[PDB]
PDB file of C-alpha atoms and ligand atoms in Angstrom:
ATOM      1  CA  UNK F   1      37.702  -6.559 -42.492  1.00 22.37           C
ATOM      2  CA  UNK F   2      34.602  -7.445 -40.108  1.00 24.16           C
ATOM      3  CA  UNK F   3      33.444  -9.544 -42.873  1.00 24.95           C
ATOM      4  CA  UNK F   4      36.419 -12.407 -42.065  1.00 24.68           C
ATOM      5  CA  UNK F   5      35.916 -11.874 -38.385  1.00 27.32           C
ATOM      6  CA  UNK F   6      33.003 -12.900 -38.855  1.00 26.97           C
ATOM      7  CA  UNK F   7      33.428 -16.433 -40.003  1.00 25.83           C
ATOM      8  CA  UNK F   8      36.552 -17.504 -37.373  1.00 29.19           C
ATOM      9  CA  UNK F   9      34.038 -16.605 -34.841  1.00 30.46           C
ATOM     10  CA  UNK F  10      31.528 -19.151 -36.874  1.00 31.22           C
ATOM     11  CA  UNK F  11      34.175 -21.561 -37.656  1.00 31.54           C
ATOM     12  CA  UNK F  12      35.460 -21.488 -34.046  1.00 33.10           C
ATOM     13  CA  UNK F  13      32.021 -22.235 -32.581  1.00 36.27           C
ATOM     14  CA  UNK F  14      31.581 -24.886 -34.679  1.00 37.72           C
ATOM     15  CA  UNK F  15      34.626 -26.953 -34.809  1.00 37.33           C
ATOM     16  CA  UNK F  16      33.960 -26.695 -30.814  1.00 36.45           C
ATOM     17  CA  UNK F  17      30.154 -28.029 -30.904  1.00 36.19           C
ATOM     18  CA  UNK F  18      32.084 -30.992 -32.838  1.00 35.02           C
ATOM     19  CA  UNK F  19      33.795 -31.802 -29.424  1.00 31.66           C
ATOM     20  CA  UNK F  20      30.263 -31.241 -27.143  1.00 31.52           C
ATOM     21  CA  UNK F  21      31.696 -27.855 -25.965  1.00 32.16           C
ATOM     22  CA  UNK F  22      29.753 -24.348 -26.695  1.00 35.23           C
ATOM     23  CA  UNK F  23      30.357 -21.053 -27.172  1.00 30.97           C
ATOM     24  CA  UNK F  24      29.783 -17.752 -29.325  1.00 31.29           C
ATOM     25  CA  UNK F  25      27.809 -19.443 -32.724  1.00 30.48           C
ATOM     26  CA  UNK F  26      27.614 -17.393 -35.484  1.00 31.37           C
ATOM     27  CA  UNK F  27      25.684 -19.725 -38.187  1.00 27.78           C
ATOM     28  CA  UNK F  28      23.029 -17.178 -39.095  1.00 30.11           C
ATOM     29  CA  UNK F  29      24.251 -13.623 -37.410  1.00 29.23           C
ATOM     30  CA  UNK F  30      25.540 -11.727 -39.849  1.00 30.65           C
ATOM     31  CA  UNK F  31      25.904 -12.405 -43.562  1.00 32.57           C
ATOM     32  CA  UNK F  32      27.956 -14.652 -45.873  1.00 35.05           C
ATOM     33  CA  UNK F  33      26.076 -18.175 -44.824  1.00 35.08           C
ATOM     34  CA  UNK F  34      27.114 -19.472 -48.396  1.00 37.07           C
ATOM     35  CA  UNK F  35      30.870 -19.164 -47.028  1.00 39.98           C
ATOM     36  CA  UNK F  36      30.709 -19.981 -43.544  1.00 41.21           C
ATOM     37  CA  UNK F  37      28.738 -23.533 -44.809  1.00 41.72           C
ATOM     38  CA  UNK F  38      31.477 -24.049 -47.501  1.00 38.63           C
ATOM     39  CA  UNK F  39      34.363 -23.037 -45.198  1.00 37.23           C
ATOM     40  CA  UNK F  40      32.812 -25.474 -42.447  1.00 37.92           C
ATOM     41  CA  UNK F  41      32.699 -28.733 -44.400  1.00 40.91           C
ATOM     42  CA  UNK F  42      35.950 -27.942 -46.331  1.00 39.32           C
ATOM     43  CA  UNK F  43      37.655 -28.058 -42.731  1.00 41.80           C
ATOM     44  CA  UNK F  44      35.940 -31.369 -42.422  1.00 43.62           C
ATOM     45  CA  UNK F  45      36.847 -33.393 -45.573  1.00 42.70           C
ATOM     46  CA  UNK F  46      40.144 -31.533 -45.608  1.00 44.23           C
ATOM     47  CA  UNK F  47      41.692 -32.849 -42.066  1.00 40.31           C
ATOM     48  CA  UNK F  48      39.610 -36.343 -42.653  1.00 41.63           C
ATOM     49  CA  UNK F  49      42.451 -36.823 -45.957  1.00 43.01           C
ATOM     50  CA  UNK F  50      45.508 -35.015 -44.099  1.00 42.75           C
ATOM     51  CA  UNK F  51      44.530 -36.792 -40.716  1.00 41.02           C
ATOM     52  CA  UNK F  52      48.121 -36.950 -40.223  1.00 45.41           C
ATOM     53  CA  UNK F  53      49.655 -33.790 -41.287  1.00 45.84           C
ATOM     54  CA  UNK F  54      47.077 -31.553 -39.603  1.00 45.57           C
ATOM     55  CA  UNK F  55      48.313 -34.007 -36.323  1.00 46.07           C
ATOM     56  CA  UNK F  56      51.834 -32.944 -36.442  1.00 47.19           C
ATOM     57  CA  UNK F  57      51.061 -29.146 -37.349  1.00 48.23           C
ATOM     58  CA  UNK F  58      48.622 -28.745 -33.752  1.00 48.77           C
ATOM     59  CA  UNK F  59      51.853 -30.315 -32.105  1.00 50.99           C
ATOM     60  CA  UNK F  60      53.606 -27.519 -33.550  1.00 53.49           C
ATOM     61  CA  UNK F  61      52.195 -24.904 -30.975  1.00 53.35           C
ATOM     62  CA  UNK F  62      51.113 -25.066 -27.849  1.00 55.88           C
ATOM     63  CA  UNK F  63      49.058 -22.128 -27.147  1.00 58.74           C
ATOM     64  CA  UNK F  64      49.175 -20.731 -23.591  1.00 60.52           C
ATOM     65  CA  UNK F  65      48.836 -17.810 -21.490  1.00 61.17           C
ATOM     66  CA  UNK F  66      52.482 -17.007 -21.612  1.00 59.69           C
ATOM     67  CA  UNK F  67      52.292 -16.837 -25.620  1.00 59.83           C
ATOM     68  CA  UNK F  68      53.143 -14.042 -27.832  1.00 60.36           C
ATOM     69  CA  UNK F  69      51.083 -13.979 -31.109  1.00 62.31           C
ATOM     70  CA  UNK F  70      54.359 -13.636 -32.908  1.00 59.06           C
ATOM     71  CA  UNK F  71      55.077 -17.552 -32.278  1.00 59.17           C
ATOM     72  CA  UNK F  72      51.398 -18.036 -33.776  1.00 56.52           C
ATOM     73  CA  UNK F  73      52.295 -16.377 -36.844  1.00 59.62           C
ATOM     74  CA  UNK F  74      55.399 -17.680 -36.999  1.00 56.53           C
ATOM     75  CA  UNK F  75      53.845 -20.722 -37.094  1.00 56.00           C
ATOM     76  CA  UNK F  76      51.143 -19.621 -39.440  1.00 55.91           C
ATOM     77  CA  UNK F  77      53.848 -18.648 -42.300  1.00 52.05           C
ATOM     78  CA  UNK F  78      55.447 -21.845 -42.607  1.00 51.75           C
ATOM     79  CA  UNK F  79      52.197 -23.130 -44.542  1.00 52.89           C
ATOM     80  CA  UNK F  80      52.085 -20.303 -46.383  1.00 48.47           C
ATOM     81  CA  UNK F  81      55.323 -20.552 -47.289  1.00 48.19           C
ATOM     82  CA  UNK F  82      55.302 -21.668 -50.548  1.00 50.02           C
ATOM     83  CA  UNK F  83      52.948 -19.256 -51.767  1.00 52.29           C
ATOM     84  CA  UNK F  84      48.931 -19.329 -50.729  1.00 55.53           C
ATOM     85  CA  UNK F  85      46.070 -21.116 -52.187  1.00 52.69           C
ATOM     86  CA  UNK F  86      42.697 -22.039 -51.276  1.00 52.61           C
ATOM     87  CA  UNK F  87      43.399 -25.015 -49.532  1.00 53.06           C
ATOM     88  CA  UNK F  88      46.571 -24.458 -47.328  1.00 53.88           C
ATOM     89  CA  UNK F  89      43.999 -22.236 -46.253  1.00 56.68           C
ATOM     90  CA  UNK F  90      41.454 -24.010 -45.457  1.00 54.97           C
ATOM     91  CA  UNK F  91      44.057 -25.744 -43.392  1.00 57.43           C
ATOM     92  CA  UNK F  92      44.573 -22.129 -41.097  1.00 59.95           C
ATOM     93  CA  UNK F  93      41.009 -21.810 -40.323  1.00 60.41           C
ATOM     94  CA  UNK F  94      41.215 -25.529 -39.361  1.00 61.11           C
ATOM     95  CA  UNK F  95      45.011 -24.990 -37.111  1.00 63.00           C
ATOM     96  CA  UNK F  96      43.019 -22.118 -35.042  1.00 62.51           C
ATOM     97  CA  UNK F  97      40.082 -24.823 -34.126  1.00 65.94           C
ATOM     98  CA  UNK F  98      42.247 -27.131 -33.059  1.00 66.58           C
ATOM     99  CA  UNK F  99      44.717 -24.820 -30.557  1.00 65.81           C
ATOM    100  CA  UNK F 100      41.526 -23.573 -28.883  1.00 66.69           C
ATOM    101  CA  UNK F 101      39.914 -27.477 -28.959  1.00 64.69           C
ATOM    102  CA  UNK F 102      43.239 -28.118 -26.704  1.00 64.38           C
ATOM    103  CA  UNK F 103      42.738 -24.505 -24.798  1.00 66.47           C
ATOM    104  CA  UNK F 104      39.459 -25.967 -23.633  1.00 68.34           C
ATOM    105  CA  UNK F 105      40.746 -29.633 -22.053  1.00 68.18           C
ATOM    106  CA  UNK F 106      43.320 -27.781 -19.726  1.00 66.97           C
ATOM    107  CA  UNK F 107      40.317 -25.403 -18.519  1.00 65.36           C
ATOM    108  CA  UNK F 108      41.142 -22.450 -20.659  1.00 66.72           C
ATOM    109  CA  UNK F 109      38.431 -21.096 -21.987  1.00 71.06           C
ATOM    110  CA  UNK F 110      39.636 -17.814 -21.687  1.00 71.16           C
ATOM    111  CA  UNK F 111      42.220 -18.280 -24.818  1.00 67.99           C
ATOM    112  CA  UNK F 112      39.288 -19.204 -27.262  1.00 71.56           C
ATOM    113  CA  UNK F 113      38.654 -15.367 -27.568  1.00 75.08           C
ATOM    114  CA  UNK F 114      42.284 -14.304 -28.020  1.00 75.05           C
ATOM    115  CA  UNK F 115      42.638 -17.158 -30.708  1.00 74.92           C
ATOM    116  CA  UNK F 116      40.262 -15.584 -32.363  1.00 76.30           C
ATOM    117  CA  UNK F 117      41.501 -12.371 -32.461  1.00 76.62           C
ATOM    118  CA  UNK F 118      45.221 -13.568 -33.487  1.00 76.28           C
ATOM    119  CA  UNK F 119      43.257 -15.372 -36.569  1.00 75.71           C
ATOM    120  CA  UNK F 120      41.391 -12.099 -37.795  1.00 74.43           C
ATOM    121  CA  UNK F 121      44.476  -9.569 -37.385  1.00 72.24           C
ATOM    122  CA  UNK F 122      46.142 -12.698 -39.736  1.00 73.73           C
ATOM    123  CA  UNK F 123      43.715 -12.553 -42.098  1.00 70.97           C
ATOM    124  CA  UNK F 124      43.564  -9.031 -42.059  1.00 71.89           C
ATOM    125  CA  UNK F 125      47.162  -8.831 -42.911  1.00 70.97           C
ATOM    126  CA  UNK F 126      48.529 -11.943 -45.133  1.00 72.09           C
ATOM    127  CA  UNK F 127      45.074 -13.507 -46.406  1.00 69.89           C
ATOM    128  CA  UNK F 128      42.854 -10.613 -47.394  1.00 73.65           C
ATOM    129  CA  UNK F 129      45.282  -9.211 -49.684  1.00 72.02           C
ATOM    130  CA  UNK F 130      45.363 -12.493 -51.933  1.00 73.14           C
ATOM    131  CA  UNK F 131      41.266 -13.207 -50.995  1.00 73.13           C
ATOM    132  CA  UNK F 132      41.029 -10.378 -52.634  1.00 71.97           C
ATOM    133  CA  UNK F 133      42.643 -11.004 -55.422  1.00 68.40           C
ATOM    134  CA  UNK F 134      41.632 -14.201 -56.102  1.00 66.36           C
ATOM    135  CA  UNK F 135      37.812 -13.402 -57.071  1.00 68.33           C
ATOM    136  CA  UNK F 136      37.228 -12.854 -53.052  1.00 71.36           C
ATOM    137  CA  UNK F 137      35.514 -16.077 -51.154  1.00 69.88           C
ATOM    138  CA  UNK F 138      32.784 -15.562 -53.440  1.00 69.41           C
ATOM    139  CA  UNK F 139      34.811 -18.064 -55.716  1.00 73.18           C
ATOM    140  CA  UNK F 140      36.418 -20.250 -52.797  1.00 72.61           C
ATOM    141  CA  UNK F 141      32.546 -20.830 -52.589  1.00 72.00           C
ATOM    142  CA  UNK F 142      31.830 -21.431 -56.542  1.00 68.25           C
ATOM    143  CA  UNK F 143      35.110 -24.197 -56.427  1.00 67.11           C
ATOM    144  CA  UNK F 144      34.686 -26.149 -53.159  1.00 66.22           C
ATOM    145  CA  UNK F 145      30.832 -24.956 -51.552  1.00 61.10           C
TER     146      UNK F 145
HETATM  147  C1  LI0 A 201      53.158 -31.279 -45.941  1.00 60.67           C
HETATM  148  O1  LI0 A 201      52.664 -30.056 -46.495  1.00 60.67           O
HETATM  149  C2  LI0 A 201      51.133 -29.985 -46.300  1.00 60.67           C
HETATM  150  C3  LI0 A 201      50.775 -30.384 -44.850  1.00 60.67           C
HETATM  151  C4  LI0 A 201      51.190 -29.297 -43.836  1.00 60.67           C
HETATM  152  C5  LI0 A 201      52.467 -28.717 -43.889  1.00 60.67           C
HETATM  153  C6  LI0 A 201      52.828 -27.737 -42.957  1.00 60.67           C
HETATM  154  C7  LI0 A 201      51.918 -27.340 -41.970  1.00 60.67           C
HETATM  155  C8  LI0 A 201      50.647 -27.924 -41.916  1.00 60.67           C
HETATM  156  C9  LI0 A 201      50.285 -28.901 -42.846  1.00 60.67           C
HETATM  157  C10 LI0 A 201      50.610 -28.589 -46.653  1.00 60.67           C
HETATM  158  C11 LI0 A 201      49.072 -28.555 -46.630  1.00 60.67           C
HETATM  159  N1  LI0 A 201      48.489 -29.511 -47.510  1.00 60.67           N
HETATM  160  C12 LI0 A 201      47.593 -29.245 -48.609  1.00 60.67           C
HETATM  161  C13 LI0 A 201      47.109 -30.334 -49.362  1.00 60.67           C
HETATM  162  C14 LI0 A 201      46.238 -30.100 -50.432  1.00 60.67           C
HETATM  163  C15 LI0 A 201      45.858 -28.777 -50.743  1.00 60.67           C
HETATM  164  C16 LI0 A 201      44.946 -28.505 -51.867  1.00 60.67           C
HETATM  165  O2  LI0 A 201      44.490 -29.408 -52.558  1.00 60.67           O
HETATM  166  N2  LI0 A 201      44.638 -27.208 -52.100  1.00 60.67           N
HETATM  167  S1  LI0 A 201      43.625 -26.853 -53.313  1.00 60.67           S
HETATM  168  O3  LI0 A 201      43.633 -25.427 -53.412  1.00 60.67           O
HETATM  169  O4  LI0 A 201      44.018 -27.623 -54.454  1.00 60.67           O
HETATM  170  C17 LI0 A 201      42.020 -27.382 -52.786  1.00 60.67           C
HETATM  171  C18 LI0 A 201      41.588 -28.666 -53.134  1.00 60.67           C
HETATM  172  C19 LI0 A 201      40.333 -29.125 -52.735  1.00 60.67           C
HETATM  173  C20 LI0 A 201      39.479 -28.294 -51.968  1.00 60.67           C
HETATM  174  N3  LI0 A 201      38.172 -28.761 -51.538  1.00 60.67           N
HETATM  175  C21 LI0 A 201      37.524 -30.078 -51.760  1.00 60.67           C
HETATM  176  C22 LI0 A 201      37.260 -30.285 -53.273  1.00 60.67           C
HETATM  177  C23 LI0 A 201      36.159 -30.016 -51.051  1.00 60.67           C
HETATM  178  C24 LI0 A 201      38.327 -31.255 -51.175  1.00 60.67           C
HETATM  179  S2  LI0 A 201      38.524 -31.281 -49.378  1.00 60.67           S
HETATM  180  C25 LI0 A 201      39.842 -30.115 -49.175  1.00 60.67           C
HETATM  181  C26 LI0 A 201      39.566 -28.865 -48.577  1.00 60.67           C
HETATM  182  C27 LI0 A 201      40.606 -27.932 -48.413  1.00 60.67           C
HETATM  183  C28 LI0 A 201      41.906 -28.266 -48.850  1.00 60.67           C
HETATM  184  C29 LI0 A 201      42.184 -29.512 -49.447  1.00 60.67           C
HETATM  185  C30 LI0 A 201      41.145 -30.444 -49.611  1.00 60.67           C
HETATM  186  C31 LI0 A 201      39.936 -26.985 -51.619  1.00 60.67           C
HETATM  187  N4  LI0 A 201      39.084 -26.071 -50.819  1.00 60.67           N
HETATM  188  O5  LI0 A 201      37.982 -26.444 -50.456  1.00 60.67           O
HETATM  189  O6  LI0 A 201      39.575 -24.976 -50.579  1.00 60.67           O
HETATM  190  C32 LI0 A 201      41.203 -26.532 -52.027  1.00 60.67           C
HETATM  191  C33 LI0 A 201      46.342 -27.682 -49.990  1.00 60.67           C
HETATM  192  C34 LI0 A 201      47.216 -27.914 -48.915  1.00 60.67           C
HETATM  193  C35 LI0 A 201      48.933 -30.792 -47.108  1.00 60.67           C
HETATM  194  C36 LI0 A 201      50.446 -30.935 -47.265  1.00 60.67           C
END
């Protein structure tokens, strides 16, 4: 809670400098830092090795302003599937970036912040129940920082 917020707002912000674009940066805001670094270059190395997977999984969703978060999640699931680990979800934080990336070349820069949102109440309710028992991010940090 808050805490996870935080860092798809950081994540988000980032992955969209990548493309030249701008918005809400939370680098150095609130807390964590550790995770937000380790969670930022994960994303990084992890699509540069599934360059192809990741490709087919933003094709799977085509965020708009007709869209009901339950697609999102519906979407969401299908990764985590098979149970959840570390890296299928680095792979989440990494889907999010790349539906708003898209929001932003049809002029919708209005979606960005509902993105966000739909990533945190996710989180919130499928991830932070395993986070925390998994040694929290604290460890996701320690294994791949
Ligand atoms: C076809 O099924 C898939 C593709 C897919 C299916 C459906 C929808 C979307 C995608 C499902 C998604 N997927 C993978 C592939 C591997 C792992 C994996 O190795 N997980 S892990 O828990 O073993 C791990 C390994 C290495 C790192 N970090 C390193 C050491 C820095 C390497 S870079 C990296 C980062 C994060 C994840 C993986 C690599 C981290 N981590 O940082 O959290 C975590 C997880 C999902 C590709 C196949």
């Amino acid at each position: 809670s808050q805490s996870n917020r935080e860092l798809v707002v950081d994540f988000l912000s980032y992955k969209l400098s990548q493309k030249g674009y701008s918005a809400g940066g939370g680098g150095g805001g609130g807390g964590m830092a550790a995770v937000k670094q380790a969670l930022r270059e994960a994303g990084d190395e992890f699509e540069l090795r599934y360059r192809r997977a990741f490709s087919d999984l933003t094709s799977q969703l085509h965020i708009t302003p007709g869209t009901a978060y339950q697609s999102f999640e519906q979407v969401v699931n299908e990764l985590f599937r098979d149970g959840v680990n570390w890296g299928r979800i680095v792979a989440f934080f990494s889907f999010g970036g790349a539906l708003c990336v898209e929001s932003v070349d049809k002029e919708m820069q209005v979606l960005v912040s509902r993105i966000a949102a739909w990533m945190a109440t996710y989180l919130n309710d499928h991830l932070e129940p395993w986070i925390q028992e998994n040694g929290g991010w604290d460890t996701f940090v320690e294994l791949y920082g």
